[PDB]
Every structure is written in C-alpha cells, then in structure tokens.
Design a protein around this ligand. Structure first.
Ligand SMILES: *[C@@H](CC(=O)OCC)[C@H](C[C@@H]1CCNC1=O)NC(=O)[C@H](Cc1ccccc1)NC(=O)[C@H](CCC(=O)OC(C)(C)C)NC(=O)OCc1ccccc1
Ligand SMILES: *[C@@H](CC(=O)OCC)[C@H](C[C@@H]1CCNC1=O)NC(=O)[C@H](Cc1ccccc1)NC(=O)[C@H](CCC(=O)OC(C)(C)C)NC(=O)OCc1ccccc1
Lengths: 306, 306
C-alpha cells in the first residue's frame, strides 16, 4: 500500500552524463555511443543571449573549441553538428555504459523522471508531468541545463526531455532529444511567458482510481453523468475536456475497481462543486493531476482493497 | 527555481540489489563486497509467521538452503549468520559494483531515498521521511521486502533502512542495516500498530525558509515569539516541541534570508491559528513536513530571491 510520486531508477542515465564546456560556459551533455548531446546555447556568451544567430556562432567554432569531460577523463571531439536547438558532438570514445535507448517526444499530460545534474554530475531525481502548456514544474538551478528527462520500459531508456531554460513564473522549458522545443519557446532571452495552464483531467481520474484500488471510496456518489454535462463543469473549473479516448484509456482501471468512468466523472464533478470537506485522498487535500493511468497501474496492486 | 521532493540518484544502489530465495519465499537482498543482507523473515513459511523462533528456524538451514541471484547469475552462499532481524549471507563473489558506503541509523525527522525493488530488480525511487513514530509513508507491494533506504554524501552511500513490513494503517516499518528495527516493532505477524504521529516542526520551518529563498514572503508577520509561547501552540496542533538545538540548526537558513528563527516561529504560529486563506506555499496548500534543513540547503539556491 501507499502512493508516492515515484521516479524511475536513474542508474542507466547517470552513466551517460558528461560536462560540456565552450569558452567560459559549462553545462551538461548526454553521452550515448560516440555522440554527446547538449543545448546549443552552450555556444552563447553574455550579449549573444538576446539575439544569437546559432548558425553564425557555430561556424566560428572548431572541434577543439569544445571540451567534454566524462568523470575525470577528457573525451576528444572529432565532429560536431547542430540539430534544431541541440548540438551533437562526435567523440573518439563510445560510451561503454550506453544502455538500450530510444528518443521519444512525450505528449502533454504524460510524466517522466528528471535527473537533475550539475557540472556533469547527477545530484537528484524526481518525477514531472509535461503540463498542457508545455512547461514542467521542475527544480533547477544555474548549471542544470542539459539535464535530461526519461522513462524506462523494461531495460530500455526512452529519453524525452533536455533542459534549456527557466521562465519568469519559475517553471521550466526544454526540448526532446531531436532538439525540438516543447511549446512555442525559443532558446534566446526574449520576453516569452508560459501560456495559461489547465488541470490534467485524465490524470486526476486515474488518481481517483488509485485511491479506490488502495481501499478508499468516500468521494463516490450514486450519480452518473454524460461526457458533455461533465465537460460543461470541467471548463468552469479550468480542467481539460474529457474525451472518449480518455474514457477508453481508463478501461482497465474501471475494470479493476468496478467503477464506470462516467460514474467516476460524476464523483469528480461533485468534488469540484463541493470541495473535499476537510478530508484527504491518498493523503492529499487537493486533486492531484501528475499521475497518468499508466503510473497508477505501475505503482498500485493489481488487486483492489475491496 | 522550483521545489520538489527529490531523491538521490539511485545508480550506486541499483548495482547492489539481488534476489534471495529460501523455500518458496523470494525477497530482495543487498550485496556489498562478499555479503548479502536481507530480512530474516525470508526463512519463515506460512504459519511460522505468527510465532516464529528465528534461532530455531535458522539452525535447520544450510548454506545451500539459500538461493541468491545477481541479475541472471547465481551467487553461491558459503556462509550465513543472523544479525538482529537480518541475515548476512557470505557469498563466493565480491560485488564488483560495491560503492563506498556506510551503515547509519537515521533519526526521526530525517529523510532518505528509497529504492523500491521486486525480485531483485529496482522499480522506482522516492524520498521519505522517518516519522516521529518510526514508520515511513512508503509505497510498497508484496515482494518489496529487503528494498533499502539511503543517502549519498559525495560518492559514499549511507544505507539507513531495509524494508520489512506494512502496518494496518498502510505505513511501513523496517530496520537499519544492523537489523535493529526503527520503533517498537517486531518481525512477526502480531497485532502491532503505529503509535500516534506528530508533525515534524523543524522541517516545516526549514520549508518556510525554502519558500522565502525562492522569493515568497506572504506568510510572514510583524511578530516574534518565545520558544515557550510557541511550544504551547505547537502542542495544541500536534506539532513537535521546538528546542534550542532546532533553533541553532536553522542558523544558516536564518542568515541567508534575514529572518530570525523565532520570527519564523511567529509566522508559523499565525499559519496554524489562521490557516493559509486559500493561498499556497511552494505550490502547497498544506504545511509540508518532509524536507529537512539540509534538504532545503541541498536543493535551494545559496542566493535568496529578495
Ligand atoms: C541552464 C544553463 C546552464 O546550466 O549553464 C550556463 C549557461 C540555465 C538553467 C535555468 C537558470 C535557473 N534555472 C534554470 O532552469 N538556463 C539558462 O540560464 C538559460 C540560458 C540561455 C542562454 C542563451 C540562450 C537561451 C537560454 N536562460 C534562462 O533560463 C533564462 C533565465 C532568466 C530567469 O528567469 O532567471 C532569473 C534569475 C532572471 C529570475 N530565462 C529566460 O530567458 O526566459 C525568458 C524571459 C527572459 C527575460 C524576461 C522574461 C522572459
Ligand atoms: C515483504 C515480504 C516479501 O517481499 O516477500 C514475501 C515474504 C512484505 C511487504 C509488505 C506487504 C505489502 N506491502 C509491504 O510493505 N512484508 C511482509 O509481507 C511481512 C512478512 C513477514 C513474515 C514473517 C514475519 C514478519 C513479517 N508482513 C507484513 O508486512 C504484514 C502484512 C499484513 C498487512 O498489513 O497487509 C494486508 C494485505 C493484510 C492488509 N504486516 C503485519 O504483520 O503487521 C502487523 C499486524 C498484522 C495483523 C494485524 C494487525 C497488525
């Protein structure tokens, strides 16, 4: 029993972190096979940051403009190219610790583990959701750029995020491992702001299923709702519209608990309208939206505490 | 910026996890050098669980009664002994992945990272506090016994917890790596219950410092309090008494923010008495008690967002 925000074991990713220096800028890189991936903003200096032209900044560098350190060992750069907002630095050594991996672009609402890293050395791990507005609520200081986000399926690491920047609200933006940003953001110091966010409805519902599997039913009611009547209420409370796809995704959790999705929806409608009356759900006084249905299945018992 | 419950990178601990079988019971073991540590309740079968005599159960086993698997490789047991509620199985191979490590007995209120493990294979990592009543609010299923808790200082792993059992409230109990339980609990299936818990006052205060360092001051007030007047209020709200030692521990955070401890105490007194008025602190609608002062210093910038 219990329910915690649980990150993937980070060992396979720790063995891939390096430090990348260019001029007086140091940040983190990811070393797989004989390539090191890092944010391209490593090539900026102070002033470059406002209006940098990366093609023009890069063509001015050689291979030996880049210093790469793996632990206490210098990796020699024998090649470099730019791919979107990332650099791909070819090095002379293949990483002997390279796990099976994939690059994946996660979708809004999905979760992943972040390995916060400084000067190429891992310092902590925590679980994030990709918000609807394409930012994450991370925890990052200066020097954390190039820290990556990932999931693990079997023994395969699916990398999905590389950290690039912090926005004025203290939330975070970055790219997939193709260097394509999540959201409308750009790697330069303009006046960009996170758009308005929404509560992730599918996840709140998954988490209500988790509470049931774990033995708690207090928030349920005798009612049902239609997808549409639910969505009218959803909009009023800044929740994402529920779709039939979301209803189908919730199938297996519905089956394990015996609670029809739209019945769980009515329960949710009631919680939004009435509050929790000073009670908790899985120890929480608020409606948690950062566990997916897959997160609940991965953590909860396959047997309901009936 | 940001503030997350952050676990230590788990790689050094993942390389030490094995599976230990005895009869039809499988659980996790920790492999350092040529010793594997596991809960001694591995030697119980069904019925043994209520009134087991471990000395009598153990003397009936040989070395080859124990099956130990490291990944896909069988480690041969050449020795075994009991130490408190743990077994120490000597094996023929020294773990080539043994990190620098210590065994430490953590104190109530202190935190640590848990590597949840099943059948010797790590499945997730999350941060816990040791509650005042010597339990943790973990997330564990059947097969999770022998999963360990740890901190990392530099590159040294300080192991502090091994998981043994779940109590009726869904919270968890276990031992240090000497096999001595945290709390009055015993490794048999009696009618034991967690004692009443308390809120960890020192940590709540550390977390209020974290909120200030991160730029937020809304909860402060013009008042001060004495240690004693504070404690009268503390008792009324099920908070631990504040001690002078706690005040001294909070020194560096006090210094970084310019807020005297007892002034932060007055602010806390006010929050307990009045509530948060529908506002959040570091994104939380409740007073968080699972970050130590060391957790705040390890995660927050050394520069206050003034
Ligand atoms: C990692 C970079 C690194 O590790 O090595 C040194 C370059 C930084 C991590 C950030 C900083 C704190 N926490 C983090 O997550 N990333 C950056 O410093 C990037 C750098 C950069 C350089 C060139 C081109 C593009 C990006 N910059 C930012 O994150 C930047 C920080 C501004 C900020 O919000 O912090 C304070 C201290 C001023 C409050 N953010 C940014 O430009 O956002 C857009 C914006 C700027 C100004 C006004 C309004 C919006
Ligand atoms: C790990 C053991 C393992 O991995 O391999 C198989 C042995 C178990 C992890 C627990 C179970 C679910 N989550 C966890 O954290 N640990 C146990 O099963 C131990 C086993 C044991 C055997 C012999 C001697 C001592 C301990 N037992 C318990 O945790 C036990 C479980 C009872 C429980 O609360 O679960 C449900 C399903 C019945 C709700 N807890 C226990 O004995 O607590 C004291 C108590 C028992 C009965 C009534 C009141 C209090």
């Amino acid at each position: 029993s219990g329910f915690r925000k649980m990150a993937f074991p980070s060992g396979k990713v720790e063995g891939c972190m390096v430090q990348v220096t260019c001029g007086t800028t140091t940040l983190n890189g990811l070393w797989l096979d004989d390539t090191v991936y890092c944010p391209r903003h490593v090539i900026c200096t102070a002033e470059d940051m406002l209006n940098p032209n990366y093609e023009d900044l890069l063509i001015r560098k050689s291979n030996h403009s880049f210093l790469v350190q793996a632990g206490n060992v210098q990796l020699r750069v024998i090649g470099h190219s730019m791919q979107n907002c990332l650099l791909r630095l070819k090095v002379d050594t293949s990483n002997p610790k390279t796990p099976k991996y994939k690059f994946v672009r996660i979708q809004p609402g999905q979760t992943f583990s972040v390995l916060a890293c400084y000067n190429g050395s891992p310092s902590g791990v925590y679980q994030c959701a990709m918000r609807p507005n394409h930012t994450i609520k991370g925890s990052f200081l200066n020097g954390s750029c190039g820290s990556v986000g990932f999931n693990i399926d079997y023994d395969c690491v699916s990398f999905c995020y590389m950290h690039h920047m912090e926005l004025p609200t203290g939330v975070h933006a970055g790219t997939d491992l193709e260097g394509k940003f999540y959201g409308p953001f750009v790697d330069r110091q303009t006046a960009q702001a996170a758009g308005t966010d929404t509560t992730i409805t599918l996840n709140v519902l998954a988490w209500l299923y988790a509470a049931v599997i774990n033995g708690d039913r207090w928030f349920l009611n005798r009612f049902t709702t239609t997808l549409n009547d639910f969505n009218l209420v959803a909009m009023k409370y800044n929740y994402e519209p529920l779709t039939q796809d979301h209803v189908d995704i919730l199938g297996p959790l519905s089956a394990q608990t015996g609670i029809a999705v739209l019945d769980m929806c009515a329960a949710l409608k009631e919680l939004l309208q009435n509050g929790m009356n000073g009670r908790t759900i899985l120890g929480s006084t608020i409606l948690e939206d950062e566990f997916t249905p897959f997160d609940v299945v991965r953590q909860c018992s396959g047997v309901t505490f009936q």
